[PDB]
């Protein structure tokens, strides 16, 4: 997320035993990084 110039990153790692779809459980995500970059971001792409 980008809020008032703050780029906030949240994440959680959890095991699974299925490759069909996403598990129907419930899990909260903790904050990990908060970078005060202040950049106008409108587009993105991933790198594999």
């Amino acid at each position: 997320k980008n809020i008032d110039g703050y780029f906030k990153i949240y994440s959680k790692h959890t095991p699974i035993n299925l490759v069909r779809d996403l598990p129907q459980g419930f899990s909260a995500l903790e904050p990990l990084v908060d970078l005060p970059i202040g950049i106008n971001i409108t587009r993105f792409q991933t790198l594999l």
Epitope: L18, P23, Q24, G25, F26
Partner: antibody, heavy 119, light 110 residues
Framework: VQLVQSGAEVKKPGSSVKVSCKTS????????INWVRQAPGQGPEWMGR????????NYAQKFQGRITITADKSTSTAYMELSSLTSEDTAIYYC??????????????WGQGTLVTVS | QSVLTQPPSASGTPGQRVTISCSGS????????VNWYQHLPGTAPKLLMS???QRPSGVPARFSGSKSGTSASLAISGLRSEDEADYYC???????????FGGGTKLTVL
């Protein structure tokens, strides 16, 4: 409301059985239907559920493609199909409803149950 | 077998309190909530406690629950004769991706 299901069924091993659970009119949309069985001398165990508005289904892992759950919107009835019946398949089957806007399920209202015996 | 461990039987005297414990593991009890049910043979079950601290709409002031670590307990005060029934504890299991139920207990009142 109330959920009314089919009566007791008696059937032979190796075949399939079909069980219905008729419900009210307003109990679709933001409401899911869950199936729970209770073997004699055993606790309840969950089989699966279906959300009629999204026509998506979930199945228990230890049922490896043995259970099928379907429903029709026009009549507002849900169907249960179980094949490859064996001697150990004897149990009592329940139909129960769930509210969809809650993270972990909590079954709130239950049917009176139907008994299936195999001999 | 039930992933949640529960004593098979419990007994109590009229007018006093009795506590029923339901023990699980970190994967299910340590991560999810517990639910309590009543069952009378020949009828349909009911709700006693939801979300581990939230009382349902109908049940009278009497049934009480608490949770601690990987175990949970249900406390009944002002016991009366109509309380004779079967109690169940249930919870979600993240490792199994399904609902797991306990074995149930039978309460007897002298």
């Amino acid at each position: 409301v109330q959920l009314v299901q089919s009566g007791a069924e008696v059937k032979k091993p190796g075949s399939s059985v079909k069980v219905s659970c008729k419900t009210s009119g307003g109990t679709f949309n933001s409401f899911a239907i869950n199936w729970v069985r209770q073997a004699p001398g055993q606790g309840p165990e969950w089989m699966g559920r279906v959300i009629p508005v999204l026509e998506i289904a979930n199945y228990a892992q230890k049922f490896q493609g043995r259970i099928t759950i379907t429903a029709d919107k026009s009549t507002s009835t849900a169907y249960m199909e179980l094949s490859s019946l064996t001697s150990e398949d004897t149990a009592i089957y329940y139909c129960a409803r769930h509210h969809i806007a809650v993270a972990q399920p909590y079954f709130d209202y239950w049917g009176q149950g139907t008994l299936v015996t195999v001999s | 077998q039930s992933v949640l461990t529960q004593p098979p039987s419990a007994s109590g005297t009229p007018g006093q309190r009795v506590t029923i414990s339901c023990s699980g593991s970190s994967s299910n009890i340590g991560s999810n909530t517990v639910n309590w049910y009543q069952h009378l043979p020949g009828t349909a079950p009911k709700l006693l406690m939801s979300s581990d601290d939230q009382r349902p709409s109908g049940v009278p002031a009497r049934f009480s629950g608490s949770k601690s670590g990987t175990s949970a307990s249900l406390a009944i005060s002002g016991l009366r004769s109509e309380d004779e029934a079967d109690y169940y504890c249930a919870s979600w299991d993240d490792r199994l991706n399904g609902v797991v139920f306990g074995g149930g207990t039978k309460l007897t009142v002298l």
